[PDB]
C-alpha cells in the first residue's frame, strides 16, 4: 500500500521539491495538491518542469482527510497551525515554524501568533539524526529550518560529548537565494542579487531561538548563538561556518564525529583539512562536514554544507515521512548529488 | 543486472553516467577507468558522486571480463582504437567515432581514417528516431548535444513535409559544460555571452546527416553556437520557411511525440526555459510564426549533460538490453 | 556653461547610470532629480552605491523649467509625451519610445497611446552614428531602444552600401536581465532567472517596428525583421546575431565595415574570424562587431555587442546631450570597459 | 604628466591599472610588459582594453629611461629583485615583497629571505592609516585585498579602545578574482567553499597593522571563502566590546568623516559587495549581539580596485603630491 500524500502550497519551491521527491518515491503517491493562487490549473501549466498533470485543488479539509494519510504544509507562518485543527486521521509534516518549538511562548515572541491548545498536540522537531525515536510515534512534525539543520548537524557530536565550550557559539552562515524563503520584493530581483553578497538580519533572525533550543537540549546548558546570515548569488546551498572554543585536539574531535555519524547515511564527515563545497550536495539529502583548528586561540572551525531545499526542507520532510510510516529512512532519498 | 563499465569516469559525462547508473534498478557499475586519476576512489576526486570504487587504468581484458556494456568518453578516435581490442561487450560511445554513416565525413571533420568501418555494426543513438535499429546494434554512436536538440526540434516538420528543408538556420545557446583552458575559467566566462565556431562546427554535418534522412531531401544547416554563463542546458532557436499554419504544425508535433516519454511539446504561446530540463532526460519544444515572412521558429531545450549526453547513453543501453526505455530515467527535472 | 541636467525617474537603472555618467562628466551637472516611488528620500538612501545625497523631488514643471537646460526622462509609455507639452526652454532626451517614431500611427499601434500634435514636435531618433547631423539642432530626442542600437549599428554599412539583400533580416538577440529594469514581477526574481536561458516575446516585440523604420530609411527599401530575443542569466550586455543573404564576399564586407567605422570612437570592427564577447563592453559606451559567412547558402552572419544600460541607454543619452549642446561627443564617455 | 610603467600588464590587476591610468588626467602609460604575451598588442589579448600598444619584454634600462613610477604585478620575490637594480623610480608593488616591517615574517610565510631589506625606504600602502609616511616613501608595498577590508573595518574601534583587541575573528568572502582545474567556471559556478582555513598569508599582514592601531597585541582568526561571483570582498568581523553600538557608530562616523573612499552606513544597514563595483569606495556596517556583547563589523570592497589597483593609484597620487582622489572620482557601476 502506497502512502497517500497531500501537499498544501504546492507551487512554492519547497512544494515543487516535494512533488519531485514524492513522484520518485517507490512507496508513496501524491493524492492531493492545493494552491490558492493557481487553484484550477494543472501544476505543469504553472511549472512545466514538474511534469505533473494533477489539477491544483482549492483547500478543503474533508477532502484532505478522505484522500490523505500524511499532509505536507508549506504556508505562511501560522496558517498550518489553523488548518491542521480541522483534519481527521492525517499525519502532519509542516515545513514552516508552527510546530518547531517546544515552548509555544518562544514561537509567539518570534512569530507573533499564539498557539492556543499546543499542550494537546503531540509534536516533535523533525531532525531525524537527533529525534528519530520520537518522530516514529509523532502525529505532527515541525520540519526544521534550513540554517538550524546545517548548524545542529555541525555541532551535535561536539555538544553531546562535551568536547567544546558551548556557552557562546559563533555562526557565520552563507545561503543561496532560495534559502531566504518566499520573497518576491525588489531586493530579490536577479539584477539586485546577481554578482553581490550581503549580510542580512544580523543577530536577530527567527532561526536563532530554534538553533538554541536544539543545541541547549544536546548540551544540557544554555547556548547563546551569535548568528550572521549572508545572501550568496547562487540559487541553492548553505555553508555554515561555526566557531567555538575547545580544549580538545582536532584528532579526538574528528574521531568523535566519525563515531557519531558512522551509521547515518546522510551525513558525511570529511577527512581533516578537507572543506566542503555547497554544490557537493546539489539536489540531494546529503550533508558534508569538515573541520579545522586554529591552534593559537584553541578555536574549532566546523563547516557544514547542505542543499537548503532538500536536506534543509523537502528532503528532510520526506525523511520524516519515512520514519513516521516505518519505512527504510532512505526510501525515495537514495540518489546522489548532481554535479557539476 | 547489466554489468556496465565507464571509460573516462572523471569527465562530466562520466560523473552523470555514474549518478544515473547507481540509481538504475536493472544495472550496476562493474568497471570505471580514468587516465588522470587512476588508483584513487572516484569520490576522492569528486565527493558529490559518493562512489567508493577505485578508478582503474584501462585494461581491455578486465573490461571484456567484467562488463556487458561499456560507455566510452575519450578524445576523438580513441574509442575507435580501443573497441578493436574488445570482444562481446556492447559499446555506447559518447564521442563522434561511430556517429557518421559515411566515415569519409568523419575523416573530413575529425581528421582520422576509420579503417574497416563498414564491418562495424554501428548506429546513431537517437532513440526517438532509430530505436528499432539500436535494439540490434553492437556499437552505438551517441549523438552530440546540439544535434540532439536540433533533430528533435525539427523531426516532425521534416517527416511530414511541413517546412522547406532546403535552408535551415540554427542559432544555439549552451551552458559552459557543453562547449579547461584559460578561456573556460570562471572569471573569463562569468557575466558574458559570446558566439564561437560560427558556421564551422563539427556537429553541422552530423545534423545534416540525420535531418536529410528524415526529410528525404537535402538539408543545409547554417549553425551559430553561443557560450552562455551558466553551467548547463541548451536552447536551439531554429528558423525555417513554411507554407503551413502554426496550428497545423503544432498538431503535427503533438501527434509525433504523443507516445514519446522524454519529449514534451509545449502549449502554443509558451517558450522553453533551459532550466526546465535540469538534471533530467526530458526535452521541451515550443514554436512561433513570423507571419509576414512565413518563418517558423522552433525552440528546443535540453540538459546538455543528460539528454544531450549521458541520459541518452543510458536510454540507448535500455534499448540494447530489452529494458523499458525509461528505466533509470523516470525522474523529473530539478527546479529552481 | 556647465550644462544643467535634470533626471525624471532617477531611481530606475537607467536613471542610476545617468547619475554615474553625469557626476563624472566635466561639462555637465545634476540640478534636478525626481522619483514617483521614492520622492522625499535621498538617492543614496535607496541606492547607497550612487553616493548621491540629493533629495529626490516630486516632479514639478516649474522647477524643471527653472533649474535645467536639459531633461532626461525615464517614465512609463506615454508619460514623457504628456509632460513635454507643459515645458518650455528645456531640451529633452527621452529614454522611452514617445519620440522614437517618424510615424505616430506606428507608435500608437504598438504602444497604444495616441500622440496628438506630433507633427508640430521637431524630434529626432538619437542614434549618433546615423543622425548626429540632425541631433545637433533637435529640441527633443527619442533615445533609441537597446536592441535597435545593437542591430542598426551592426547593419548600417551593409545597408548603406547595398552589400546585402535587406528584404528579410533575421535577428536572434540575447540580453542580460537589466533590460527588464527594476520591476518586481516574479519572472525577474533571482531564483527564476538564474542558471536558465529563455526566448521571450518571439516575433512580437515593440522594438521590431523601430528597427524596421531605421533600417528601411538607410536601405531605401522595405525591411521585414524576424526578431527573437532571449533573456540570459547575466546582469548586463546585449549580443545581437543577425542573418542576411548577400552576393558579396566576406572580405569585401569586412573592408566596407572597417572603412565605415574608421573614425567612430565607440564602434569597433573586430578582426576577421573574431567574435564579440558582451562583457568586452561592460560599463562603457563601446560597441564590438564581428562577422562570418556561411558559404553554401550565401548567409552573412553579423554579431554586435553593447552594454544595454550604457550605449543601449544612458550613455547614448549623454552622447546625444553632448551633440545637442555642441560638446566633444566623447565627453564624459572616454572610459574603457571594465574587465573582468 | 606622470610616466607610469606596468610590469605584468596581462593580469587582472594590470588590466585595471591600464583602465585607471588611461583615465587619469595627470598620468600616462609609457611602459607595458608581460612575461606571457610580450610581442603582442594588449588588445589582441584583451580586446576590451582598447589598447593597441605592444607588450614589452621587461628591460630595466628602458624602464629607468621612460618612467617616474613603476607598478609591479609579478610572482612573489620577483621585485624586490629588479627594484634594487633600478634608481630614480618610485615603486608600487602589488605583491607582498614590501608590505612587511619584519622581513623574517615574510620569509617564513613567503619562503624567501629578503637580504638588504633594512635600508630600503618601504612603507605599507594603506593611505587611510599611512599617507604621511607614504608621502615620502620611494617604495610602497601595496596591501593585499583581504587586509585592506579588515583593517578599514577595525581602525576606529582599535584606535579608540572600543573593543577587546585580544581576540578578533574574521570570516571573509571573496569573488573568484580575489588558474587550475578548480578555478574553472563549471567547478566554481553555483558553489561556495572555504579555503586555506586558519592558514593564510594575509593573517600576519593584518596582525601587523591592527596591533599598531590598538597599541596592544591582536590575535586574528581568519577564514576565507570563495563566492561564485567575479569580484567583491565582504569581511564579517566579530570582536567582544563593553561599549554601546551607538557609541561605536559615532566613533566610526568621526574617524572616517574626511576620508573620501570610506563610507559608514546608517545603523541597521549592511553593505552589499556590488555597491563598490569597479570603484575605490568602501562600505562599513555593524551590529551588536547584546546578550554576548559581540560587535559584528562588516566591510565591503572591490578586490580589484580598492583591494588592488585603485589603492595603488591612490598611493601614486600621494607619492606625487596629487589630490588623493585624482583618477579615482568615479562612482560604482550599478547594477
From Swiss-Prot, chain B:
Subcellular compartments: Cytoplasm
PANTHER family associated with the record: N-ACETYL-GAMMA-GLUTAMYL-PHOSPHATE REDUCTASE, CHLOROPLASTIC-RELATED (PTHR32338:SF10), N-ACETYL-GAMMA-GLUTAMYL-PHOSPHATE REDUCTASE, CHLOROPLASTIC-RELATED-RELATED (PTHR32338)
SMART domains documented for this protein: Semialdhyde_dh
Keyword flag Amino-acid biosynthesis: yes
Keywords, alphabetical: Amino-acid biosynthesis, Arginine biosynthesis, Cytoplasm, NADP, Oxidoreductase
Protein name (database record): N-acetyl-gamma-glutamyl-phosphate reductase
GO cellular component, one term: cytoplasm
Family to which the UniProt record says this protein belongs: Belongs to the NAGSA dehydrogenase family. Type 1 subfamily.
GN (gene name): argC
GO BP annotation list: L-arginine biosynthetic process
Major location category of this protein: cytoplasm
GO molecular function: N-acetyl-gamma-glutamyl-phosphate reductase activity; NAD binding; NADP+ binding
Species in which this protein is naturally found: Thermotoga maritima (strain ATCC 43589 / DSM 3109 / JCM 10099 / NBRC 100826 / MSB8)
Enzyme type, top EC level: oxidoreductase
Source taxon at top rank: Bacteria
The reaction(s) this protein catalyses: N-acetyl-L-glutamate 5-semialdehyde + phosphate + NADP(+) = N-acetyl-L-glutamyl 5-phosphate + NADPH + H(+)
Described purpose of this protein according to its UniProt entry: Catalyzes the NADPH-dependent reduction of N-acetyl-5-glutamyl phosphate to yield N-acetyl-L-glutamate 5-semialdehyde.
Amino acid at each position: 500500500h502506497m502512502i497517500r500524500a497531500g501537499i498544501i502550497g504546492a507551487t512554492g519551491y519547497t512544494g515543487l521539491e516535494l512533488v519531485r521527491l514524492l513522484k520518485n518515491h517507490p512507496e508513496a503517491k501524491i493524492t492531493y495538491l492545493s494552491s490558492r493562487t493557481y487553484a484550477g490549473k494543472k501544476l505543469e501549466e504553472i511549472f512545466p518542469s514538474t511534469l505533473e498533470n494533477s489539477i491544483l485543488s482549492e483547500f478543503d479539509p474533508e477532502k484532505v482527510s478522505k484522500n490523505c494519510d500524511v499532509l505536507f504544509t508549506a504556508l505562511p507562518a501560522g496558517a498550518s497551525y489553523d488548518l491542521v485543527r480541522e483534519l481527521k486521521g492525517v499525519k502532519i509534516i509542516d515545513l514552516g515554524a508552527d510546530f518547531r518549538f517546544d515552548d509555544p511562548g518562544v514561537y509567539r515572541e518570534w512569530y507573533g501568533k499564539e498557539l492556543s491548545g499546543y499542550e494537546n498536540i503531540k509534536r516533535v522537531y523533525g531532525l531525524p539524526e537527533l529525534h528519530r525515536e520520537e518522530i516514529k510515534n509523532a502525529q505532527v512534525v515541525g520540519n526544521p529550518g534550513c540554517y538550524p539543520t546545517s548548524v545542529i548537524l555541525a555541532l551535535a557530536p561536539a555538544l553531546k560529548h562535551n568536547l567544546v565550550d558551548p556557552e557562546t557559539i559563533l555562526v557565520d552562515a552563507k545561503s543561496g537565494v532560495s534559502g531566504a524563503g518566499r520573497k518576491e520584493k525588489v531586493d530579490y530581483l536577479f539584477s539586485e542579487v546577481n554578482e553581490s553578497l550581503r549580510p542580512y538580519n544580523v543577530a536577530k533572525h527567527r532561526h536563532v531561538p530554534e538553533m538554541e533550543q536544539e543545541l541547549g537540549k544536546i548540551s544540557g546548558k544554555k547556548v547563546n548563538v551569535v548568528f550572521t546570515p549572508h545572501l550568496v548569488p547562487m540559487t541553492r546551498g548553505i555553508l555554515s561556518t561555526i566557531y567555538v572554543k575547545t580544549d580538545k585536539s582536532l584528532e579526538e574531535i574528528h574521531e568523535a564525529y566519525l563515531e557519531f555519524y558512522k551509521n547515518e547515511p546522510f551525513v558525511h564527515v570529511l577527512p581533516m583539512g578537507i572543506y566542503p563545497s555547497t554544490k557537493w550536495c546539489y539536489g540531494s539529502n546529503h550533508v558534508f562536514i569538515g573541520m579545522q583548528m586554529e591552534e593559537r586561540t584553541n578555536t574549532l572551525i566546523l563547516m557544514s554544507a547542505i542543499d537548503n531545499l532538500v536536506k534543509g526542507a523537502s528532503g528532510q520532510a520526506v525523511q520524516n515521512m519515512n520514519i513516521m510510516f516505518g519505512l527504510d529512512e532512505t526510501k525515495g532519498l537514495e540518489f546522489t548529488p548532481i554535479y557539476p
